[PDB]
Amino acid sequence: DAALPSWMPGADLPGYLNGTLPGDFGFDPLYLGQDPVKLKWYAQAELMNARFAMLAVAGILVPELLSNIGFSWPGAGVAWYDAGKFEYFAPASSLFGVQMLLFAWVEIRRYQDFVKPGSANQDPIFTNNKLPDGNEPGYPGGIFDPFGWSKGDIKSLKLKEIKNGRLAMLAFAGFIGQAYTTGTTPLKNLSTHLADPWSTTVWQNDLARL
Amino acid sequence: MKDFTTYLSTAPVIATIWFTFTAGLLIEINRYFPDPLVFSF
Amino acid sequence: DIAGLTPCSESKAYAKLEKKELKTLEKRLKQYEADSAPAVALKATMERTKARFANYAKAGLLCGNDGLPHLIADPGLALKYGHAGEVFIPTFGFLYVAGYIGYVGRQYLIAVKGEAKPTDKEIIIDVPLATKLAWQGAGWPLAAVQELQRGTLLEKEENITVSPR
Amino acid sequence: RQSWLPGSQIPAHLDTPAAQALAGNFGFDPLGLGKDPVALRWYQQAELIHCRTAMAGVAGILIPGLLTKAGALNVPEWYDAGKVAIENSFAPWGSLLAVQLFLCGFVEAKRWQDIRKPGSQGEPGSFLGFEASLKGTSELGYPGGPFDPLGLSKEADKWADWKLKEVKNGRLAMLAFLGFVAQKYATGAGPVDNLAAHLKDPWHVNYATNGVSLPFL
Amino acid sequence: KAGNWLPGSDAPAWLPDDLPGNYGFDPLSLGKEPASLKRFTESEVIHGRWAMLGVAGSLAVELLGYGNWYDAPLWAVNGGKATWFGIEVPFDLNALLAFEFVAMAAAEGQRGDAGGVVYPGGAFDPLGFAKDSSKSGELKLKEIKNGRLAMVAFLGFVAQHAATGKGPIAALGEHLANPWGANFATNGISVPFF
Numbered sequence: 111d112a113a114l115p116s117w118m119p120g121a122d123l124p125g126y127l128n129g130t131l132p133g134d135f136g137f138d139p140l141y142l143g144q145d146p147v148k149l150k151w152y153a154q155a156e157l158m159n160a161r162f163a164m165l166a167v168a169g170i171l172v173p174e175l176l177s178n179i180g181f182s183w184p185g186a187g188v189a190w191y192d193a194g195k196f197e198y199f200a201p202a203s204s205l206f207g208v209q210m211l212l213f214a215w216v217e218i219r220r221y222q223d224f225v226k227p228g229s230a231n232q233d234p235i236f237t238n239n240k241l242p243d244g245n246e247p248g249y250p251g252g253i254f255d256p257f258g259w260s261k262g263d264i265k266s267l268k269l270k271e272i273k274n275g276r277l278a279m280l281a282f283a284g285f286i287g288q289a290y291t292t293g294t295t296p297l298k299n300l301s302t303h304l305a306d307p308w309s310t311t312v313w314q315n316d317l318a319r320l
Numbered sequence: 321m322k323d324f325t326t327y328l329s330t331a332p333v334i335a336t337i338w339f340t341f342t343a344g345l346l347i348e349i350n351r352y353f354p355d356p357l358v359f360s361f
Numbered sequence: 362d363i364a365g366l367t368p369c370s371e372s373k374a375y376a377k378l379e380k381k382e383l384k385t386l387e388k389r390l391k392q393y394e395a396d397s398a399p400a401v402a403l404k405a406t407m408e409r410t411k412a413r414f415a416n417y418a419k420a421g422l423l424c425g426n427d428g429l430p431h432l433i434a435d436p437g438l439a440l441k442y443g444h445a446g447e448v449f450i451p452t453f454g455f456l457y458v459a460g461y462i463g464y465v466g467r468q469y470l471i472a473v474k475g476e477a478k479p480t481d482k483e484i485i486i487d488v489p490l491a492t493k494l495a496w497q498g499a500g501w502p503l504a505a506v507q508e509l510q511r512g513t514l515l516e517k518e519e520n521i522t523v524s525p526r
Numbered sequence: 527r528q529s530w531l532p533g534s535q536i537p538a539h540l541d542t543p544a545a546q547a548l549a550g551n552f553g554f555d556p557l558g559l560g561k562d563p564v565a566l567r568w569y570q571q572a573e574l575i576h577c578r579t580a581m582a583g584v585a586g587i588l589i590p591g592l593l594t595k596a597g598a599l600n601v602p603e604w605y606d607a608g609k610v611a612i613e614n615s616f617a618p619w620g621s622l623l624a625v626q627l628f629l630c631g632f633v634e635a636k637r638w639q640d641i642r643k644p645g646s647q648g649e650p651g652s653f654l655g656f657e658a659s660l661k662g663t664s665e666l667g668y669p670g671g672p673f674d675p676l677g678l679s680k681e682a683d684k685w686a687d688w689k690l691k692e693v694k695n696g697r698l699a700m701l702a703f704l705g706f707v708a709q710k711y712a713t714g715a716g717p718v719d720n721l722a723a724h725l726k727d728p729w730h731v732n733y734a735t736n737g738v739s740l741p742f743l
Numbered sequence: 744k745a746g747n748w749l750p751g752s753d754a755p756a757w758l759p760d761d762l763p764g765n766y767g768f769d770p771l772s773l774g775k776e777p778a779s780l781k782r783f784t785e786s787e788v789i790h791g792r793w794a795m796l797g798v799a800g801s802l803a804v805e806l807l808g809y810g811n812w813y814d815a816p817l818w819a820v821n822g823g824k825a826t827w828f829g830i831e832v833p834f835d836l837n838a839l840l841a842f843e844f845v846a847m848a849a850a851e852g853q854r855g856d857a858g859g860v861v862y863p864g865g866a867f868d869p870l871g872f873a874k875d876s877s878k879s880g881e882l883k884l885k886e887i888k889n890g891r892l893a894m895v896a897f898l899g900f901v902a903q904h905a906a907t908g909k910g911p912i913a914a915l916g917e918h919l920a921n922p923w924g925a926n927f928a929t930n931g932i933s934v935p936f937f
């Protein structure tokens with residue numbers, strides 16, 4: 111290893127994590143990323159779960175935030191764990207069908223990029239359009255990077271991405287756990303913790319609940 | 321006591337021990353499961 | 362209703378035999394006091410008798426005109442009318458154990474054939490070897506089939522024979 | 527070495543190159559059933575078929591069981607589903623079993639003759655061109671081709687671990703089916719309901735506290 | 744070689760570029776052997792021609808008002824008096840079944856005794872459109888692509904009927920009346936839980 115950051119200062123890190131991935135702090139106490147093929151898979155899995163969890167915590171909080179602020183949606187005040195029972199123009203059936211067809215397309219595209227990097231950088235129809243060569247799996251760029259980032263700043267930005275994404279994955283785990291234990295919305299849990307933080311610890315609530 | 325355990329490994333002693341074991345197993349099976357005319361359990 | 366045999370739960374001679382045995386036991390029991398050692402013994406014997414009769418009638422056994430349970434040896438009649446636990450199931454139950462014994466003894470013989478004095482390993486048993494083989498003889502049917510298919514269960518014409526073949 | 531008993535003397539027939547290539551070789555052969563290499567090959571095939579069949583069946587037991595405990599389905603218990611499915615069916619269970627035995631005997635006889643001679647069902651002219659795709663692969667029990675749509679066996683990097691995952695999940699699922707059977711015979715409830723009853727009171731709801739497993743206790 | 748079927752996936756080496764309809768789609772590697780591949784090349788065109796005719800018929804029987812493809816054979820059962828374009832035909836099930844056996848036996852035996860023949864010019868090419876030329880290759884590609892589309896479409900007929908119970912045009916009208924409330928996801932068959 112080296113003088114890189116570490117999840118535990120002084121700990122003898124495993125070594126196969128040597129900074130080349132974003133957010134490398136040596137945390138692999140179960141040695142799940144020991145084999146480089148499993149590590150190449152888990153890097154992309156981390157990126158994907160991370161980005162989807164970031165989107166999810168955004169779409170759970172900022173609706174909750176906009177509703178507690180007092181804006182008007184048809185879908186305001188409906189909990190994130192109750193938005194499926196909500197009625198829309200289509201039943202959830204057709205929504206899952208369309209979702210899975212479209213995601214089959216784009217996820218098989220992403221998987222073709224992962225299997226053979228540099229392959230899915232081209233449109234079916236408009237071949238004038240393409241993604242810039244030299245990209246990595248998980249970081250397509252081009253039309254996925256339209257606002258003009260990735261020129262410099264890229265290691266800083268990848269570290270930022272994976273840090274916010276780990277935080278968001280933990281936040282979604284917390285949404286699930288808090289909605290299963292407290293049975294309420296997450297920002298209302300924040301409000302009940304900020305009301306009196308000393309009588310609303312998880313220890314306190316879980317002891318009172320049994 | 322290598323020679324004593326060689327004696328205990330002799331055909332008559334081993335036969336006595338093994339048949340005491342088999343008979344005791346059958347006797348205990350017939351005490352705890354008495355009168356087993358048919359396989360029904 | 363297999364060979365004119367009535368179930369022991371419906372036969373009256375079976376109940377007659379039960380009450381006869383119990384009458385014998387209680388006529389012996391009348392001689393002793395309330396809780397003597399003989400009284401305890403005879404009450405336990407009566408309980409064993411009642412339990413035995415209940416457990417034979419519960420097992421679907423067929424009875425004759427004498428009220429005694431008759432076993433069905435035929436597979437096909439035992440499996441059609443639920444009498445497989447009489448002779449059919451214990452058949453393979455026995456054959457497993459008998460092939461166990463034979464296979465274990467065979468393996469012991471074959472293992473001690475290699476020693477310099479194989480005869481003194483038969484009057485003085487190699488107990489660790491014997492126990493190893495006794496434990497690993499639980500899979501005797503599979504091992505015997507696989508030794509049969511290799512042609513290594515049988516000896517060829519190296520066995521000895523009398524002069525007129 | 528990755529043994530089942532770290533201090534055991536592993537049998538010499540499971541330390542051979544021909545046996546250490548087998549998936550999930552932890553030296554477990556206390557009865558010496560695979561001392562014959564041919565028997566070890568045949569029993570490896572038997573282990574694979576049992577493990578895949580048990581994986582499929584135990585999934586079909588506990589996944590719909592979990593989904594009917596969660597309301598997503600109303601599948602009856604696995605010890606009741608045959609009667610329920612045959613009372614809603616187009617066929618008696620006898621004709622069903624006959625068609626099933628014919629269709630399964632065909633493919634299992636093909637698998638049998640491939641075990642007898644590896645790569646023999648690719649004898650040209652046997653099927654209608656499909657025999658080309660029935661040669662199997664270099665490894666017996668891992669046929670590939672039409673049985674491998676996603677092409678996950680064409681790596682030679684994840685292949686050993688794919689094997690290991692298969693055989694380990696399959697041994698686990700075989701144990702799981704044996705447990706379904708024993709738990710039905712000892713409790714009278716479903717496997718997921720057994721899990722629930724154990725998770726609501728583990729220290730008084732287990733095999734030590736039913737009247738079947740330990741009659742002495 | 745016309746198309747890739749998976750942009751980036753390099754083509755299998757056993758599928759020749761001169762094969763009409765070659766997109767490199769053999770993930771199961773069924774056509775790795777040349778004789779298997781020849782049989783499959785003939786059978787694909789045969790299945791495709793039969794499926795083109797079958798889809799044309801299932802669409803023409805409903806667009807002209809004589810019911811759907813599934814309910815057409817229920818004159819043999821459920822009574823009698825077969826019809827064609829409304830004209831009732833004097834053949835019961837047994838007579839036309841036997842004549843179909845005889846005629847198709849003669850035809851497909853004449854076809855099988857020819858070995859592998861998939862493009863029999865002459866009596867089957869009277870208007871002279873294919874003479875093993877640029878147009879012939881292009882037309883073979885067109886034929887095999889319309890045949891693959893028609894095979895997919897007949898599989899769709901069967902699945903949509905087994906899920907919905909409607910006809911092809913009836914299901915199309917249902918979908919155009921409610922594209923989001925009437926699709927494969929909204930029936931209680933295709934997707935398991937909903």
Ligand code: CLA
Binds near residue numbers: 346354355356357458
């Ligand atoms: C060959 C003729 C023959 C036959 C077939 C029988 C058969 C029987 N006799 Mg009769 N008997 C015979 C000769 C015979 N006997 C003779 C010659 C005598 C005079 C000595 C007697 C005197 C006699 C009496 C006095 C009694 C019997 C009884 C019985 C029953 C025994 C049931 C039992 O013990 O369950 C045992 C059940 C088992 C399952 C044991 C099988 C052995 C092992 C344990 C199985 C293996 C399990 C497992 C793999 C082991 C793992 C390893 C282990 C080390 C842990 C059975 C019907 C008894 C009875 O009730 O009859 C109705 C009884 O009371 N017999």
Ligand code: CLA
Binds near residue numbers: 698706720724736739
């Ligand atoms: C495949 C794994 C597996 C799992 C997870 C369970 C789980 C359970 N079993 Mg089942 N069971 C199994 C296999 C399994 N069993 C097998 C193979 C048998 C036949 C010997 C049984 C026979 C059995 C009976 C008779 C009963 C249970 C019961 C139970 C429950 C309480 C545990 C208990 O009493 O000890 C389980 C009993 C054993 C003898 C232990 C067998 C476990 C084997 C060796 C595999 C698991 C060991 C593994 C190293 C650690 C767990 C793996 C897990 C993380 C996947 C629990 C839900 C009880 C119940 O229904 O309570 C509500 C009960 O009465 N089980």
Ligand code: CLA
Binds near residue numbers: 281285310311
């Ligand atoms: C993203 C991190 C995160 C954050 C900020 C919170 C915040 C909160 N949680 Mg939640 N929670 C989380 C993750 C998180 N949780 C996860 C992953 C789980 C699953 C185990 C839970 C399960 C859970 C339950 C069951 C309950 C809470 C409750 C609470 C509240 C009171 C705190 C408490 O009692 O201790 C809870 C603390 C933990 C469970 C420890 C998790 C710590 C995470 C993994 C790392 C924290 C990051 C960093 C070191 C510190 C924060 C930095 C930054 C955010 C400022 C508070 C609003 C309680 C509530 O509703 O209050 C009213 C309550 O009953 N949480």
Ligand SMILES: CC(/C=C/C=C(C)/C=C/[C@@]12O[C@]1(C)C[C@@H](O)CC2(C)C)=C\C=C\C=C(C)\C=C\C=C(C)\C=C\[C@@]12O[C@]1(C)C[C@@H](O)CC2(C)C
Binds near residue numbers: 557575703
């Ligand atoms: C195939 C299998 C299970 C298949 C299950 C199926 C099809 C289930 C089907 C269904 O449930 C569904 C889906 C739905 C239901 O409605 C209908 C049915 C039909 C009921 C289990 C095998 C289960 C097989 C088991 C449990 C085998 C265990 C073997 C062991 C432990 C062997 C141990 C040893 O042999 C070794 C390994 C080495 C030796 O040296 C030492 C010893 C100890 C001898």
Ligand SMILES: CC(/C=C/C=C(C)/C=C/[C@@]12O[C@]1(C)C[C@@H](O)CC2(C)C)=C\C=C\C=C(C)\C=C\C=C(C)\C=C\[C@@]12O[C@]1(C)C[C@@H](O)CC2(C)C
Binds near residue numbers: 789894898
């Ligand atoms: C769908 C189909 C075949 C699909 C095959 C596929 C996807 C194969 C895929 C792959 O193999 C490849 C390519 C390469 C491999 O490496 C990968 C896989 C994936 C394995 C055939 C349909 C083939 C369909 C055919 C031949 C249909 C014929 C229809 C007829 C004759 C209809 C007749 C009628 O409808 C009328 C006219 C009037 C009615 O009243 C009466 C009737 C009789 C119902």
